[PDB]
RNA sequence: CAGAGUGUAGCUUAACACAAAGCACCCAACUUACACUUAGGAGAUUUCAACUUAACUUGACCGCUCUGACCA
């Protein structure tokens, strides 16, 4: 009751919860693993998805790339005509982390590139000018937006 | 009209500012096991455990058994793990608790149980039912 | 470490055999994929285009 | 002023080049990884042809066979030389050439002169007034004798601090002693020439990195060098 | 005829009984209580014992569950516990520990399903 | 979705079946191992980098709020994978041409 | 180099004895991955003594940390 002393005790509205760069601080960062084999690209990708994990970095999505092949030909032995030899696929992993400081920056990347297999390029890039981040929106969440609004 | 609390609040200490860098419980089990926690401690509001729970006097319960026997610990802990070492020594014993085939034997159990815990837990268990609280008041 | 995270295999319920194989490079670099066939090695031709 | 002179230390690092050989305990791993993978996988199009023409044998239009075909594979590899992934210069133990120890990473360590005694420390230069003292660790790349080399510096903060003191010589109130900031970089591509290399610098990995530096010094280094 | 603490239906678990049996499994080791619904607690059985460790190979396995569950069983008929309830989550139910721990307290005598109250 | 495609499933000896059930037992301590490097070689860096910027505010103040400042060049930031082994100085490919499918 | 300070695996004001505990941590399975769950793994009292219980108290023995000596 408002009343007595133990007013407000059931509240757990404050406890839930309901991107701009700064100079101290990263805003977005997209780590691209690139390779031909997709063991190590997703396995390189769940390697750095939990060492941000247990280093307090927030991670605000992983994915994937579409794939990419490439058909390889090689000149044909004596001759002019191009033959099929081999075909090479590019499959690549992306992990959002948002939330870098910026002198943590050199020792992440150190441990990074230290743990990169081999095959496997490692490209890190600021795409927060980027923006385009349309995702689809459940209910509760789209209901609060209009409270607001209105 | 407000009231000020008597007493902390229960989630006072919880830091509103950096609400996205607290771990979460992520699971039932984890706000299970600390919900119980806290409900087992005393409050100043009224609780369940003020109407149900059974009243106990302050003073804590007077002992007129004999006096508990002195071991050496130290001495204790030795034997204890070099034992347990050569139980896992076996290849034969980690294979048996891998497949899941393994068991131990009940009347030995209860020859150690008897001799190092089984008067502590003889003493609960009477005070269940209330031999303590007829007989010696 | 080049091998903190190098040793994994295939995390799929369904999926076709591969085999050890060495991409060369068009610079003589090597480097362990997984190929379809149990091909011995793969060398990568440069593209006449980009020439 | 300040009695503390600043230096702006540099510490430039080669990343390994080739991968680190794997562990008897790896290998274990490994094999069986791939005894998995093959045990849960289904039939591939050499697999589905191998199987069809031994088939069409036993009853008895491919001209060439599954297994006939891979001995071809296996003529070409053998024909091809691989790259020594162990060169000359570590038989040599020439430890001023990028070239060794392709698998661990190295660090450049340049000997220099003070008081009539020749000590090996990380290349520095003096800090300048107008000038950040990042750009003073990149100035020391310019003072290095015949150089041409490109290096990724990563971050603008000091990784590490080393402080010194006279031993009573050079001591006095404007002079106390020194204080030198180290800044880590990538050396990405080129190399020294070769007018000079074994009195100048040498590459040495963590292990080593105690012959050169002074115990007192080598303890600040080894805190932000890693060894993976 | 002992009436029994009905009500609870928002919450878990529930309070409709005389006794329960409660599995406390830690990460190193693995314990289960017998308590009555005051909360007084009427039997254990730890593997923190010597008694029990002394035969274990390893306190926090399958085999640890059910060598629990068996000792406990023995203990629960020497003290007259023949009847209580148990309350696990989806998950414990459906691990393999749980069932074996189970077993054996269906297999040494003891009940998990206490009987209705007598109102009439 | 072809069932024709599918491979005969050999059943495992028991002695397969130990081998593999105890190496990843082993698995299990030898990555721990490598976690914990890693876990403390990420502190070593963390702690002397504090350390340092600590004595170079109290040098300079002036250099302390630039090193702290964020670098725009470093991103985009691109490392090359490592190989199996070394290019070759003297190594040319054979002519082909790359076609790519998407 | 002494000067003080300091002592349980990662943490803890866990450790009355019945006993070295709780949490964190690592693998496999599930998951694009994370998380959850299941099934598994590695673990600790610096070392000796003190009428004995002494992880706890009294001493050193041992390492660590801190301030100067030392120092390019």
């Given at each position: 009751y408002k009343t007595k002393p133990t007013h407000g005790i059931g509240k757990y509205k404050h406890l839930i919860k309901a991107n701009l760069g700064t100079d101290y601080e990263y805003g977005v960062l997209n780590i691209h693993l690139t390779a031909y084999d997709m063991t190590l690209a997703e396995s390189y990708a769940q390697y750095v998805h939990n060492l941000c994990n247990s280093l307090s970095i927030k991670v605000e999505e992983s994915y994937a790339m579409p794939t990419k092949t490439i058909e390889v030909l090689q000149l044909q032995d004596q001759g002019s005509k191009m033959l099929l030899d081999s075909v090479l696929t590019t499959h690549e992993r992306v992990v959002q982390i948002s939330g870098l400081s910026a002198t943590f920056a050199e020792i992440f990347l150190e441990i990074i590139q230290s743990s990169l297999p081999e095959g496997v390029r490692l490209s890190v890039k600021e795409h927060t000018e980027e923006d385009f981040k349309g995702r689809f929106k459940a209910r509760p969440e789209l209901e609060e937006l209009l409270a607001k609004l209105k | 009209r407000r009231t000020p609390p008597l007493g902390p609040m229960p989630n006072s200490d919880i830091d509103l500012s950096n609400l996205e860098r607290l771990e979460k419980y992520r699971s039932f089990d984890r706000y299970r096991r600390r919900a119980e926690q806290e409900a087992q401690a005393p409050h100043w509001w009224r609780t369940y455990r003020e109407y149900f729970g059974e009243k106990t006097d302050p003073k804590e319960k007077i002992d007129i058994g004999l006096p508990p026997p002195k071991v050496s610990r130290t001495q204790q802990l030795l034997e204890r793990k070099q034992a347990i070492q050569e139980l896992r020594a076996n290849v034969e014993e980690e294979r048996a608790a891998r497949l899941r085939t393994a068991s131990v034997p009940l009347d030995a159990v209860r020859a150690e149980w008897e001799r190092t815990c089984g008067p502590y837990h003889k003493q609960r268990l009477a005070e269940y039912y209330g031999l303590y609280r007829d007989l010696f008041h | 470490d080049s091998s903190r995270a190098s040793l994994?295999?295939?995390?799929?319920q369904a999926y076709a055999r591969l085999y050890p194989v060495l991409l060369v490079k068009q610079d003589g670099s090597t480097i362990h994929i997984r190929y379809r066939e149990p091909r011995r090695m793969l060398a990568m031709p440069i593209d006449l285009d980009t020439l | 002023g300040s009695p503390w002179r600043l230096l702006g230390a540099l510490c430039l690092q080669r990343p390994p080049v080739v991968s680190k050989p794997l562990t008897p305990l790896q290998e274990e791993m490994a094999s069986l990884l791939q005894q998995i993978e093959i045990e849960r996988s289904l039939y591939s199009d050499h697999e589905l042809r191998a199987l069809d023409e031994n088939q069409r044998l036993a009853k008895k239009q491919d001209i060439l066979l599954a297994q006939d075909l891979e001995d071809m594979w296996e003529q070409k590899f053998l024909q091809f030389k691989l790259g020594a992934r162990i060169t000359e210069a570590d038989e040599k133990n020439d430890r001023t050439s990028l070239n060794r120890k392709l698998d661990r990473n190295l660090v450049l360590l340049v000997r220099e002169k003070f008081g009539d005694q020749d000590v090996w420390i990380l290349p520095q230069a003096e800090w300048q007034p107008g000038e950040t003292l990042r750009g003073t660790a990149e100035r020391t790349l310019a003072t290095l004798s015949e150089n041409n080399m490109e290096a990724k510096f990563l971050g603008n903060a000091p990784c590490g601090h080393y402080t010194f003191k006279f031993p009573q010589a050079m001591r006095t109130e404007s002079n106390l002693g020194a204080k030198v900031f180290f800044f880590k970089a990538l050396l990405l591509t080129g190399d020294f020439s070769q007018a000079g290399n074994k009195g100048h610098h040498v590459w040495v990995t963590k292990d080593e990195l105690g012959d050169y530096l002074k115990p007192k010094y080598l303890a600040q280094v080894r805190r932000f060098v890693s060894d993976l | 005829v002992a009436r029994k603490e009905r009500?609870?239906?928002?919450?878990?678990?529930?309070?409709?009984?005389w006794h329960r049996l409660r599995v406390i499994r830690t990460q190193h080791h693995v314990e289960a209580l017998v308590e009555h619904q005051n909360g007084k607690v009427v039997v254990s059985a730890s593997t923190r014992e010597w008694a029990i460790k002394k035969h274990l190979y390893s306190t926090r396995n399958v085999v640890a569950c059910e060598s629990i569950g068996r000792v406990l069983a023995q203990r629960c008929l020497e003290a007259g516990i023949n009847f209580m309830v148990y309350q696990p989550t989806p998950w414990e139910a459906a691990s393999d520990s749980m069932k074996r721990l189970q077993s054996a307290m269906t297999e040494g005598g003891v009940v998990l399903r206490e009987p209705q109250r007598i109102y009439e | 979705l072809d069932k024709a495609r599918e491979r005969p499933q050999v059943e495992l000896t028991f002695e397969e079946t130990e081998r593999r059930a105890l190496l990843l037992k082993k698995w299990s301590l030898y990555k721990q191992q490598e976690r914990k490097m890693e876990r403390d070689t990420i502190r070593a860096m963390l702690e002397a980098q504090q350390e340092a910027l600590e004595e170079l505010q109290l040098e300079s103040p002036k250099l302390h709020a630039e090193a702290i400042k964020r670098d725009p060049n470093l991103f985009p930031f691109e490392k090359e994978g490592p190989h199996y082994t070394p290019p070759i100085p003297n190594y040319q490919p054979p002519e082909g041409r790359y076609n790519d499918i998407t």
């Amino acid at each position: 009751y408002k009343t007595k002393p133990t007013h407000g005790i059931g509240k757990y509205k404050h406890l839930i919860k309901a991107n701009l760069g700064t100079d101290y601080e990263y805003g977005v960062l997209n780590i691209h693993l690139t390779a031909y084999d997709m063991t190590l690209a997703e396995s390189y990708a769940q390697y750095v998805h939990n060492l941000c994990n247990s280093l307090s970095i927030k991670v605000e999505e992983s994915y994937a790339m579409p794939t990419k092949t490439i058909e390889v030909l090689q000149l044909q032995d004596q001759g002019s005509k191009m033959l099929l030899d081999s075909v090479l696929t590019t499959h690549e992993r992306v992990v959002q982390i948002s939330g870098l400081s910026a002198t943590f920056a050199e020792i992440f990347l150190e441990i990074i590139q230290s743990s990169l297999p081999e095959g496997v390029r490692l490209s890190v890039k600021e795409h927060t000018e980027e923006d385009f981040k349309g995702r689809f929106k459940a209910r509760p969440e789209l209901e609060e937006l209009l409270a607001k609004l209105k | 009209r407000r009231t000020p609390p008597l007493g902390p609040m229960p989630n006072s200490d919880i830091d509103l500012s950096n609400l996205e860098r607290l771990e979460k419980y992520r699971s039932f089990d984890r706000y299970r096991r600390r919900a119980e926690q806290e409900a087992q401690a005393p409050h100043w509001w009224r609780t369940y455990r003020e109407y149900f729970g059974e009243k106990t006097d302050p003073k804590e319960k007077i002992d007129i058994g004999l006096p508990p026997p002195k071991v050496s610990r130290t001495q204790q802990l030795l034997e204890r793990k070099q034992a347990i070492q050569e139980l896992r020594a076996n290849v034969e014993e980690e294979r048996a608790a891998r497949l899941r085939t393994a068991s131990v034997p009940l009347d030995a159990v209860r020859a150690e149980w008897e001799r190092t815990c089984g008067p502590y837990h003889k003493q609960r268990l009477a005070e269940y039912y209330g031999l303590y609280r007829d007989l010696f008041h | 470490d080049s091998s903190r995270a190098s040793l994994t295999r295939v995390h799929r319920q369904a999926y076709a055999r591969l085999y050890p194989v060495l991409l060369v490079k068009q610079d003589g670099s090597t480097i362990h994929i997984r190929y379809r066939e149990p091909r011995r090695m793969l060398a990568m031709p440069i593209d006449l285009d980009t020439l | 002023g300040s009695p503390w002179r600043l230096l702006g230390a540099l510490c430039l690092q080669r990343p390994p080049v080739v991968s680190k050989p794997l562990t008897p305990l790896q290998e274990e791993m490994a094999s069986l990884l791939q005894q998995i993978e093959i045990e849960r996988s289904l039939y591939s199009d050499h697999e589905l042809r191998a199987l069809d023409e031994n088939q069409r044998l036993a009853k008895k239009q491919d001209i060439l066979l599954a297994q006939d075909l891979e001995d071809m594979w296996e003529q070409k590899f053998l024909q091809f030389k691989l790259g020594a992934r162990i060169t000359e210069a570590d038989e040599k133990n020439d430890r001023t050439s990028l070239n060794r120890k392709l698998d661990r990473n190295l660090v450049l360590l340049v000997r220099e002169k003070f008081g009539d005694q020749d000590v090996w420390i990380l290349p520095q230069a003096e800090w300048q007034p107008g000038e950040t003292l990042r750009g003073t660790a990149e100035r020391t790349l310019a003072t290095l004798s015949e150089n041409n080399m490109e290096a990724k510096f990563l971050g603008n903060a000091p990784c590490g601090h080393y402080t010194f003191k006279f031993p009573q010589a050079m001591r006095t109130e404007s002079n106390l002693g020194a204080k030198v900031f180290f800044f880590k970089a990538l050396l990405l591509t080129g190399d020294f020439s070769q007018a000079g290399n074994k009195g100048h610098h040498v590459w040495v990995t963590k292990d080593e990195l105690g012959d050169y530096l002074k115990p007192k010094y080598l303890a600040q280094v080894r805190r932000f060098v890693s060894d993976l | 005829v002992a009436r029994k603490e009905r009500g609870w239906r928002t919450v878990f678990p529930s309070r409709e009984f005389w006794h329960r049996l409660r599995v406390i499994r830690t990460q190193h080791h693995v314990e289960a209580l017998v308590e009555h619904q005051n909360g007084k607690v009427v039997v254990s059985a730890s593997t923190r014992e010597w008694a029990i460790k002394k035969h274990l190979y390893s306190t926090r396995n399958v085999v640890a569950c059910e060598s629990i569950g068996r000792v406990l069983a023995q203990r629960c008929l020497e003290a007259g516990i023949n009847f209580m309830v148990y309350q696990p989550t989806p998950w414990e139910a459906a691990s393999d520990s749980m069932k074996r721990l189970q077993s054996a307290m269906t297999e040494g005598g003891v009940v998990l399903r206490e009987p209705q109250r007598i109102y009439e | 979705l072809d069932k024709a495609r599918e491979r005969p499933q050999v059943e495992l000896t028991f002695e397969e079946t130990e081998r593999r059930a105890l190496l990843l037992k082993k698995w299990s301590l030898y990555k721990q191992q490598e976690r914990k490097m890693e876990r403390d070689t990420i502190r070593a860096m963390l702690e002397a980098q504090q350390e340092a910027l600590e004595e170079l505010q109290l040098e300079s103040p002036k250099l302390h709020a630039e090193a702290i400042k964020r670098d725009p060049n470093l991103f985009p930031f691109e490392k090359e994978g490592p190989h199996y082994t070394p290019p070759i100085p003297n190594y040319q490919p054979p002519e082909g041409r790359y076609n790519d499918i998407t």
